Amino acid sequence: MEKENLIIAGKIGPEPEILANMYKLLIEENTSMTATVKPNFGTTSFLYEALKKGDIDIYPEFTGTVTESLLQPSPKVSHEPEQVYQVARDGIAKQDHLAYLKPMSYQNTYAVAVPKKIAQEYGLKTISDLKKVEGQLKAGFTLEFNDREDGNKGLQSMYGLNLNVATMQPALRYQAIHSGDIQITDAYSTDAELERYDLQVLEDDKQLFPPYQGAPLMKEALLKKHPELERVLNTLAGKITESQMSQLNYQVGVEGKSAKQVAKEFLQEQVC
Numbered sequence: 329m330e331k332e333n334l335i336i337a338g339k340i341g342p343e344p345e346i347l348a349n350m351y352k353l354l355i356e357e358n359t360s361m362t363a364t365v366k367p368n369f370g371t372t373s374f375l376y377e378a379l380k381k382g383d384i385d386i387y388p389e390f391t392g393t394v395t396e397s398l399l400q401p402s403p404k405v406s407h408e409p410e411q412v413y414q415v416a417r418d419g420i421a422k423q424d425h426l427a428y429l430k431p432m433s434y435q436n437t438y439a440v441a442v443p444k445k446i447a448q449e450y451g452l453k454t455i456s457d458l459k460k461v462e463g464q465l466k467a468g469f470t471l472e473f474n475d476r477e478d479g480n481k482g483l484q485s486m487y488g489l490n491l492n493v494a495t496m497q498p499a500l501r502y503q504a505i506h507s508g509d510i511q512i513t514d515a516y517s518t519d520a521e522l523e524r525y526d527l528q529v530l531e532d533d534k535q536l537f538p539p540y541q542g543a544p545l546m547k548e549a550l551l552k553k554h555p556e557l558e559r560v561l562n563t564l565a566g567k568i569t570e571s572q573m574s575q576l577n578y579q580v581g582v583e584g585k586s587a588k589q590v591a592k593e594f595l596q597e598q599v600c
């Protein structure tokens with residue numbers, strides 16, 4: 329009786345924890361394997377390096393993050409989600425022999441956000457509009473967003489924006505923008521905090537941000553050993569809407585429910 333245990337990790341926050349718990353539930357129900365979820369395991373580069381080193385077995389990675397952060401050189405991608413997925417999938421298999429399974433439906437993009445009041449007061453609708461006020465407002469951005477070419481380096485290069493940026497921890501940036509310590513932050517578009525704190529996402533008028541859909545990323549060797557993982561995890565391929573994920577994020581991060589329970593009830597009610 330081979331009862332291999334898979335280590336399923338997530339980036340920071342309730343959403344990767346929810347996803348990792350969905351993977352665990354699906355794997356334990358439909359395979360002979362068990363899984364352990366590692367919440368808040370780290371940021372993108374750490375999940376990626378841990379995956380390549382074998383320290384974790386699966387994590388949810390996002391299509392535009394594969395092409396921008398993980399592929400070297402980074403290919404030039406369009407705004408069509410399925411083509412970006414194919415670029416990410418083919419590229420990461422060739423580069424790192426990682427198998428990137430089929431993406432979920434929802435997009436979770438970086439989103440430059442300001443309080444509604446600020447957008448109204450300063451006449452902000454687009455990211456380009458921030459040039460109007462870059463000497464007046466303060467931004468608080470995660471370090472990873474600051475480090476990424478599709479993040480603050482891209483605000484600089486694509487938009488010529490020179491924001492006054494405080495580097496922030498992921499879990500502290502929304503309280504900072506809600507309290508007025510900052511007026512700009514790098515939201516994730518499925519974060520529950522956008523609605524909870526009456527924040528407005530500025531339109532990405534120059535299309536800095538690629539599409540970002542999540543999907544399981546694992547070593548090709550793991551899929552070869554356990555080919556059933558493809559069918560089992562692709563249960564979620566093309567499922568989960570933006571509104572659905574944002575509500576799950578609300579349940580875990582705002583209402584404090586366990587990610588396992590929230591994941592289980594969603595799968596029971598909406599997928600299986």
Ligand SMILES: C[N+](C)(C)[C@@H](Cc1c[nH]c(=S)[nH]1)C(=O)O
Nearest residue numbers: 339340371393436437438516540
């Ligand atoms: C979903 N997302 C917005 C495209 C980001 C979110 C993220 C980046 N780093 C951490 S931690 N989370 C990503 O996963 O690359």
